[PDB]
């Protein structure tokens, strides 16, 4: 069937390519994140720094709508005043490294928007199952 | 439709630049020499064979060797390993004593001076009541004159104590591998021509570096990694004359060094369970320890570096060389550690040439110090024991360290001189290809999907 | 240099069962799919095994495929005479970031009988004598094994001037074909009474002879 | 060797104004440095890296320029600001300028 | 879906080889990979590059990445390869391939026929084709060998059809020899029954593409 197809790369392998092709593989970029006489103190503080970072990320993802989905969607509409880009060009033109410098200004606000949105949705569905 | 919705993505491959600690690890053959005789197996997990070296396409990053980190912690870590390899060994406190010295038995010409002095003194035995009379040999660079008769003392016994190294622990380097912990990566520029600053268009990431052998040398760095094709010079600001110039050349040039005098060690006892190693009899003729290099290969490589150096200063330029200008001992000459003994070898015979705009072997003589003081710490002097037999060692000269003279007042020639300076530049000759970057997941991007209630 | 290693040649009787091993490292084989390809000499290659055990339609189930660790293996049960070819293993490698091929393995099937050679000795055309040259052509076809000997000869002596020779080339019937040309002028052509191509194959010596009297 | 050229130099003005001295290099690409020397005293650093100020420096001294051409501009001149000034790329040096009360 | 190759067989050193791959039976825009493969003498197989059919995304061998370029034109349904500053290592046979359908009963991969490409400084040559006329020592027991010597053509190849390809029975294009002059010479024979020797006519239609010529030389029997 397949004579020669693109198999898979290492973690950060796709990161030069476009975001549409890079979104096919996330599990590789996710798995290489946890694990694979004064010096023991340096190794132990390295390991606990690693698990501290990963647990912070898991909690920050948990307080939004999606705990463990690894791909989410939500109910906050995109304001075009941040990005001013077409839909047709971003998924077939740019990389994430290219993307991050463009969206670097508008951060730390979108997170709070997600927080408030998830909070209001939870209290409204709470009221729904309250009258249920 | 036009209501695009935000979508969060976990594990987007993207990074930033950062600084953190690192990880030391070597092979499994270093554990065969058991019981921590070599250092860096107190603190070494064995490396796993064939780590991944994954390649990348289009992505292009910029590097900078001069403000690069992790070299600073390497210079810290080697010093800390050196200090950890000494506290289980004996002190040499009761050795600072009045020495009765004379010349060794040799048909000496009057104008030449003795390189060996022959001294005898008192020392405590295993008990406290007996004391004995014993003799040994020393070099002239270790005793000084206290002030009829003629008597000496050691050089260091007025500012510090003195620690003898153990004869168990060896001194040869071994390939240290550096590795990143979980949640970082190490990049590597694989470009063939990259001087040391700026963007590199073909990168590759990695989890662990290649083999690095730490050797300490002041000029003419040894056993290094040569470049691919040409001879590359690198500097930070070339028109500034304060910064050194690193020259990495292509073909290695062989060097021999040897000490021919046969030596006999001898074990004096200080007291309960304390050994001390003198230098006993000398069987043979007293010759002088020296180094050989080949003539034509040296001249041809100097022609190579002249041809490459001419591009940074215009074509019509006279270029010459000169020996070191002055200073303390271990920066005029070049200095190294062969066979578990330290050499300081004069280099004036190599850097005397001038270069116009268009079988035999060179020797050079050395000297031998027994006590050393590397890194110039304020209270730390280290003795080294002698060894047995004729000693010789072969190596590959690989790189060079130079310094331009600050010549004002309208002179077309640009002389160059060797200058040792810091120990950091030897590591900067090998970590010129790695920066350390930090992974960041959870990007966020708009698209057309919406979560249902 | 090839990052995938194979032993270069192997031979076996018809009906035999052999295993061709492809040896590499973890970085290429241990994570990717490997493929097995077949080509004849002078022939574009053909896929045999894709994704380490699967065969496309048009290919028999006579071959089998397995993979373990950093090694791959093809197994031929019931070797046929048709399988005199060159086989290759192929994969993709991360460290080079590229597709790579193996060492190549020439499967020469045993049991082929020794075939006595067919010889043809052409004189030059009279056009070539008008061009003042003389090509003597010795075509040696349909023979086994591929150890053939050509020798060009004069009236009483040998000649090795103007001689060029193609080797026994394994043709479509798994036998061999070869050729030799003897290049002279037309004046050197008419300077002799005969020219001979004497070929030795399987100990058998056969000499074809033309005469410049016979043009 | 890189030679610096100093412009206008001898400059006589009144207090409360702004002034600007000029310097030009024979080789572009490098940074610039400005030094103040008063009468019978020790010189003092004003400008390093062509725009940065040292300690004890009010920001009314502003250096600027690019390539080979650099300007030093002082606004709101005071009595202590009347001094001699020097430009500096590397071990080389310029001849100087003179600020005098008019 | 058939794949065929086009281009000059001889390239001068330090110049740019160009190749055109013509595809039949399908579109180039389909969701498939299209790849170039070259084969050195000694049968060293080496991947060059590939490009996806739909959007045109490319991936080359990095080790030649400076000098290789691959393009696709859907208008002519063609693939194109360009290699600048060729040297002697680039003498190879070239195929263009399609990856194959990810289904149950596929034919496997789809291979081209190939172009042989020679990197050389010497000038090309139109061949000298001479009719190997069968002598009486060639006409043994009612079967004769009659052929054509394609002497001094440079570079390879020459295609030999027989009566414009209408006869393929009993023919054999033998392996060519590589002379000390550096020029190739091949033998292409057909074995013919003797009774047809007086009636039928036999042209070898030999073609040399790098010199862009075709010689149609008839083989005729004559006494001396
Ligand atoms: C740049 O890199 C080169 C290449 O490695 C270095 O050159 C080597 O330096 C090492 C020093 O560590 C030399 O190793 C020494 O070799 C001696 C001779 O070994 C020969 O003889 C033994 C016994 O017959 C054989 O088994 C062996 O195969 C050799 O043929 C040894 O005697 C030394 O060991 C001594 O010390 C240990 C320490 O306890 C004792 O246990 C031993 O019993 C013995 O007393 C040591 O192994 C080596 O010879 C050098 N050359 C080569 C070609 O490797 C350079 O040193 C390095 N550059 C610099 C500046 O150092
Ligand atoms: C690194 O290696 C280089 C290369 O070897 C060394 O360079 C040489 O250093 C010596 C220093 O000793 C240079 O000077 C020579 O010293 C001689 C010693 O003088 C003795 O003899 C005189 C009488 O001649 C006595 O009065 C005196 O007390 C000493 O006993 C001088 O005599 C030499 O003079 C020579 O040249 C002059 C001028 O031509 C003649 O008049 C003399 O007759 C004699 O021929 C000389 O001055 C020597 O020149 C250096 N070599 C070169 C090639 O220049 C470095 O010293 C070494 N580095 C270190 C730190 O040692
Ligand atoms: C020669 O030596 C110099 C040092 O003497 C050496 O360093 C380079 O100097 C240039 C200055 O020309 C640096 O470029 C600066 O980089 C910083 C980094 O953030 C920027 O902030 C700077 O911005 C300028 O413009 C701003 C506009 O308002 C100002 O506010 C600001 O103060 C600056 O004027 C400027 O881009 C450069 O980073 C260094 N280092 C390097 C590696 O280039 C230089 O490398 C040596 N060699 C050469 C060939 O010059
Ligand atoms: C530093 O010291 C080392 C000491 O080992 C020294 O390395 C040795 O040098 C010798 C001579 O330079 C090398 O011997 C060579 O051997 C090869 C292979 O056997 C030969 O091709 C050479 O000559 C042979 O053939 C000649 C005729 O062509 C004969 O006349 C001759 O006698 C030989 O038979 C040559 O002699 C030896 O291989 C090296 N060994 C190593 C391990 O390097 C080195 O040369 C010294 N450094 C310098 C700069 O001199
Ligand atoms: C300086 O080094 C020398 C040798 O390099 C040392 O000299 C040796 O000292 C011993 C002392 O026991 C002498 O041994 C005696 O020798 C005589 C000779 O017959 C013998 O009769 C005695 O019974 C005893 O064995 C030895 O001779 C002497 N070496 C020489 C050449 O005379 C010396 O210890 C060192 N220190 C000094 C001189 O302070
Ligand atoms: C090592 O220990 C020995 C033995 O303890 C020391 O020998 C002693 O040396 C001193 C001074 O050299 C001697 O004092 C001298 O005594 C003589 C006569 O007794 C006198 O004429 C002198 O004016 C001086 O007072 C002492 O007697 C002597 N003792 C012995 C037992 O020999 C030696 O000095 C110590 N050090 C070294 C470096 O050898
Ligand atoms: C080492 O490699 C770096 C990177 O290639 C070199 O730095 C670059 O040097 C060039 C000069 O050859 C600089 O170009 C200059 O740019 C300014 C920008 O305005 C322009 O005005 C000048 O006329 C000149 O064209 C370039 O900016 C500089 N940096 C980068 C990032 O490319 C460096 O020269 C190389 N060699 C050495 C010996 O350091
Ligand atoms: C670098 O090269 C210069 C020139 O070759 C070296 O200068 C030379 O230095 C030596 C020792 O410093 C001078 O030797 C003198 O010998 C007399 C003999 O009595 C002595 O009285 C003096 O005190 C001095 O030791 C020598 O004259 C001098 N050469 C010249 C031409 O001035 C310099 O030593 C070299 N640097 C190194 C590290 O070798
Ligand atoms: C690495 O970089 C190269 C060079 O930029 C990439 O090749 C480029 O791939 C894009 C695919 O998005 C091509 O853009 C599109 O091409 C089609 C062709 O029909 C056109 O219709 C579109 O409007 C758009 O231009 C681009 O032409 C192509 N450039 C080259 C020089 O080949 C490559 O995809 C990157 N990634 C990898 C993994 O190699
Ligand atoms: C040990 O060696 C030194 C060094 O040569 C000798 O010192 C010499 O002493 C004489 C007389 O005091 C002087 O004339 C010489 O000039 C000195 N040499 C030097 C280089 O300065 C000392 O005499 C030697 N002692 C013995 C016992 O041999
Ligand atoms: C260096 O000195 C030692 C000590 O004398 C020499 O070793 C001797 O070698 C001879 C020859 O085999 C033996 O007879 C002795 O027994 C050895 N002595 C010891 C203590 O082992 C050694 O040979 C010398 N090195 C040379 C000459 O190169
Ligand atoms: C010093 O240089 C020599 C050659 O000048 C190096 O020797 C080569 O080492 C490689 C790797 O082990 C071998 O594959 C080669 O066969 C060796 N010889 C040659 C002629 O290339 C040597 O590795 C260098 N380094 C040391 C520490 O000796
Ligand atoms: C120790 O002795 C040396 C010998 O010259 C001298 O230079 C140094 O100043 C002395 N240091 C002290 C602290 O006495
Ligand atoms: C180096 O070799 C060249 C060519 O053999 C020669 O011309 C030159 O003089 C040599 N260098 C020196 C310093 O003699
Ligand atoms: C200068 O160069 C040559 C060769 O090294 C020679 O004339 C002389 O020994 C050198 N100078 C010194 C001081 O060694």
UniProtKB/TrEMBL annotation, chain A:
Provide the Retroviral envelope protein GP41-like domain boundaries.
19-132
- Would you list which residues are glycosylated? 79, 86, 93, 105
Q: Which residues form a coiled coil?
A: 101-132
> Transmembrane segments in this chain: where?
1-24
Membrane topology summary = Single-pass type I membrane protein
Q: Residues annotated as region Fusion peptide?
A: 1-21
Protein localization: Virion membrane; Host cell membrane; Host endosome membrane
Taken from the UniProt record, the cysteine pairs bridged by disulfide bonds within this chain are 66-72
List the residue ranges of the region (Immunosuppression): 42-60
What name appears for this protein in its UniProt entry? Transmembrane protein gp41
From TrEMBL, chain B:
Q: What is this protein called?
A: Envelope glycoprotein gp160
User: How would you describe the post-translational modification of this protein?
Assistant: Highly glycosylated by host. The high number of glycan on the protein is reffered to as 'glycan shield' because it contributes to hide protein sequence from adaptive immune system. Palmitoylation of the transmembrane protein and of Env polyprotein (prior to its proteolytic cleavage) is essential for their association with host cell membrane lipid rafts. Palmitoylation is therefore required for envelope trafficking to classical lipid rafts, but not for viral replication.
Q: Where is the Human immunodeficiency virus 1 envelope glycoprotein Gp120 domain?
A: 4-110, 114-453
Another remark in the UniProt entry says:
HIV-1 lineages are divided in three main groups, M (for Major), O (for Outlier), and N (for New, or Non-M, Non-O). The vast majority of strains found worldwide belong to the group M. Group O seems to be endemic to and largely confined to Cameroon and neighboring countries in West Central Africa, where these viruses represent a small minority of HIV-1 strains. The group N is represented by a limited number of isolates from Cameroonian persons. The group M is further subdivided in 9 clades or subtypes (A to D, F to H, J and K).
Q: Source species, please?
A: Human immunodeficiency virus type 1
Question: Listed GO molecular functions?
Answer: identical protein binding; structural molecule activity
First and last residues shown, out of full length? 30 to 502 of 860
Hey, which family's this protein in? Answer: Belongs to the HIV-1 env protein family.
What's the domain remark here? The CD4-binding region is targeted by the antibody b12. The 17 amino acids long immunosuppressive region is present in many retroviral envelope proteins. Synthetic peptides derived from this relatively conserved sequence inhibit immune function in vitro and in vivo.
Q: Does the keyword DNA damage apply?
A: no
Q: What does this protein do?
A: Envelope glycoprotein gp160: Oligomerizes in the host endoplasmic reticulum into predominantly trimers. In a second time, gp160 transits in the host Golgi, where glycosylation is completed. The precursor is then proteolytically cleaved in the trans-Golgi and thereby activated by cellular furin or furin-like proteases to produce gp120 and gp41. Transmembrane protein gp41: Acts as a class I viral fusion protein. Under the current model, the protein has at least 3 conformational states: pre-fusion native state, pre-hairpin intermediate state, and post-fusion hairpin state. During fusion of viral and target intracellular membranes, the coiled coil regions (heptad repeats) assume a trimer-of-hairpins structure, positioning the fusion peptide in close proximity to the C-terminal region of the ectodomain. The formation of this structure appears to drive apposition and subsequent fusion of viral and target cell membranes.
Q: Where is this region: CD4-binding loop?
A: 324-334
Region annotated V5, chain positions: 409-419
């Amino acid at each position: 069937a397949v004579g020669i197809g693109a198999v898979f790369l290492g973690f950060l392998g796709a990161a030069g390519s476009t975001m549409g092709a890079a979104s096919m593989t996330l599990t590789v970029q996710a798995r290489n994140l946890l694990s694979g006489t004064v010096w023991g103190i340096k190794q132990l503080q390295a390991r606990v720094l690693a698990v501290e970072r990963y647990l912070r990320d898991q909690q920050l993802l948990g307080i939004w709508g999606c705990s463990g989905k690894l791909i989410c969607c939500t109910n906050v509409p995109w304001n075009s005043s941040w990005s001013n880009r077409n839909l047709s060009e971003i998924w077939d033109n740019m990389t994430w490294l290219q993307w991050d410098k463009e969206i670097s200004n508008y951060t730390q606000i979108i997170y709070g928007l997600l927080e408030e949105s998830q909070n209001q949705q939870e209290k409204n569905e709470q009221d729904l199952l309250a009258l249920d | 439709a036009e209501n695009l919705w935000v979508t969060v993505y976990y594990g987007v491959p993207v990074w930033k630049d950062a600084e953190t600690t690192l990880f030391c690890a070597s092979d499994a053959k270093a554990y065969e020499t058991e019981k921590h005789n070599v250092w860096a197996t107190h603190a070494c997990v064995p490396t796993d064979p064939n780590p991944q070296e994954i390649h990348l396409e289009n992505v292009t990053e910029e590097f900078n060797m001069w403000k690069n980190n992790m070299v600073e912690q390497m210079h810290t870590d080697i010093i800390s390993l050196w200090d950890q390899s000494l506290k289980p060994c004996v002190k040499l406190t009761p050795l600072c004593v009045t020495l009765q010295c004379t010349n060794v038995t040799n048909n000496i010409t009057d104008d030449m001076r003795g390189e060996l002095k022959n001294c005898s003194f008192n020392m405590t035995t295993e008990l406290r009541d007996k004391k004995q009379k014993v003799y040994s040999l020393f070099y002239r660079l270790d005793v000084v004159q206290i002030n009829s008769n003629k008597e000496y003392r050691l050089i260091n016994c007025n500012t510090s104590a003195i620690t003898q190294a153990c004869p168990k622990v060896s001194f040869e380097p071994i390939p240290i591998h550096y590795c990143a912990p979980a949640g970082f990566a190490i990049l590597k520029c694989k470009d063939k021509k990259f001087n040391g600053t700026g963007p590199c268009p073909s990168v590759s990431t990695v989890q662990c570096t290649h083999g690095i052998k730490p050797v300490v040398s002041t000029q003419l760095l040894l056993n290094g990694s040569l470049a691919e094709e040409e001879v590359m010079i690198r500097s930070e600001n070339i028109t500034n004359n304060a910064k050194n110039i690193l020259v990495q050349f292509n073909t290695p040039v062989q060097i021999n060094c040897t000490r021919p005098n046969n030596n006999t060690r001898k074990s004096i006892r200080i007291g309960p369970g304390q050994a001390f190693y003198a230098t006993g009899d000398i069987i043979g003729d007293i010759r002088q320890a020296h180094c050989n290099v080949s003539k034509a290969t040296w001249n041809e490589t100097l022609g190579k570096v002249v041809k490459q150096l001419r591009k940074h200063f215009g074509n019509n330029t006279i270029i010459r060389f000169a020996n070191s200008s002055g200073g303390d001992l271990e920066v005029t000459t070049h200095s190294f550690n062969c066979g578990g003994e330290f050499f300081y070898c004069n280099t004036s015979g190599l850097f005397n040439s001038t270069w116009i705009s268009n079988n035999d072997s060179i020797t050079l003589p050395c000297r031998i110090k027994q006590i050393i003081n590397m890194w110039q710490r304020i209270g730390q002097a280290m003795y080294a024991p002698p060894i047995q037999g004729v000693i010789r060692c072969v190596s590959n000269i690989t790189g060079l360290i130079l310094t331009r003279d600050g010549g004002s007042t309208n002179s077309t020639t640009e002389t160059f001189r060797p200058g040792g300076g810091d120990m950091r530049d030897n590591w900067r000759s090998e970590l010129y290809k790695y920066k350390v970057v930090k992974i960041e997941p959870l990007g966020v991007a708009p698209t057309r999907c919406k979560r249902r209630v | 240099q090839f990052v995938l290693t194979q032993p270069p040649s192997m031979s076996g009787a018809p009906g035999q069962r052999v295993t061709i091993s492809c040896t590499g490292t973890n970085s290429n084989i241990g994570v990717n799919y490997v493929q097995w390809y077949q080509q004849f000499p002078g022939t574009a290659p053909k896929l045999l095994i894709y994704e380490n055990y699967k065969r496309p339609s048009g290919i028999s189930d006579r071959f089998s495929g397995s993979q373990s660790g950093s090694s791959a293996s093809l197994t031929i049960t019931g070797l046929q005479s048709e399988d005199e070819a060159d086989y290759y293993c192929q994969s993709y490698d991360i460290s080079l970031g590229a597709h790579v091929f193996g060492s190549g393995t020439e499967l020469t099937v045993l049991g082929q009988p020794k075939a006595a050679p067919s010889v043809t000795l052409f004189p030059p055309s009279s056009e070539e004598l008008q061009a003042n040259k003389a090509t003597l052509v010795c075509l040696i076809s349909d023979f086994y094994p591929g150890a053939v000997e050509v020798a060009w000869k004069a009236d009483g002596s040998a000649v090795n001037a103007g001689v060029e020779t193609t080797k026994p080339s394994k043709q479509s019937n798994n036998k061999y074909a070869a050729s030799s040309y003897l290049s002279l002028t037309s004046d050197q052509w008419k300077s002799h009474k005969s020219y001979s191509c004497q070929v030795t194959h399987e100990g058998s010596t056969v000499e074809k002879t033309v005469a410049p009297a016979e043009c | 060797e890189i030679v610096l050229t100093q412009s206008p130099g001898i400059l006589s003005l009144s207090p409360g104004e702004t002034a600007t001295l000029f310097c030009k290099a024979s080789q572009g690409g490098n940074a610039m440095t400005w030094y103040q020397k008063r009468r019978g005293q020790v010189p003092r650093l004003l400008i390093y890296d062509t725009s940065r100020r040292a300690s004890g420096v009010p920001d009314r001294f502003v250096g600027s320029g690019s390539g080979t051409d650099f300007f030093l501009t002082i606004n709101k001149l005071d009595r202590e600001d009347f001094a001699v000034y020097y430009c500096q790329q590397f071990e080389f040096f310029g001849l100087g300028s003179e600020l005098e009360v008019h | 879906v058939q794949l065929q190759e086009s281009g000059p067989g001889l390239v001068k050193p330090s110049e740019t080889l160009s190749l055109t791959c013509g595809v039949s039976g399908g579109s180039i825009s389909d969701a498939y990979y299209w790849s170039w493969i070259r084969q050195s003498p000694g049968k060293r197989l080496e991947w060059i590059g590939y490009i996806f059919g739909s959007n045109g995304g490319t991936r080359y061998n990095p080790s030649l990445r400076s000098r290789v370029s691959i393009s696709i034109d859907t208008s002519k349904n063609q693939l194109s390869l360009k290699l600048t500053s060729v040297t002697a290592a680039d003498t190879a046979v070239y195929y263009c391939v399609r990856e194959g359908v990810p289904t149950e009963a596929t034919t496997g991969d789809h291979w081209g026929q190939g172009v042989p490409v020679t990197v050389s400084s010497a000038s090309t040559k139109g061949p000298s084709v001479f009719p190997l006329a069968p002598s009486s020592r060639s006409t043994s027991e009612s079967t004769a060998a009659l052929g054509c010597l394609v002497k001094d053509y440079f570079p390879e190849p020459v295609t030999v059809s027989w009566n414009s390809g209408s006869l393929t029975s009993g023919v054999h294009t033998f392996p060519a020899v590589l002379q000390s002059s550096g020029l190739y010479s091949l033998s292409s024979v057909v074995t013919v029954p003797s009774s047809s020797l007086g009636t039928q006519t036999y042209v070898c239609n030999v073609n040399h593409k790098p010199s862009n010529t075709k010689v149609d030389k008839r083989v005729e029997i004559k006494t001396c």
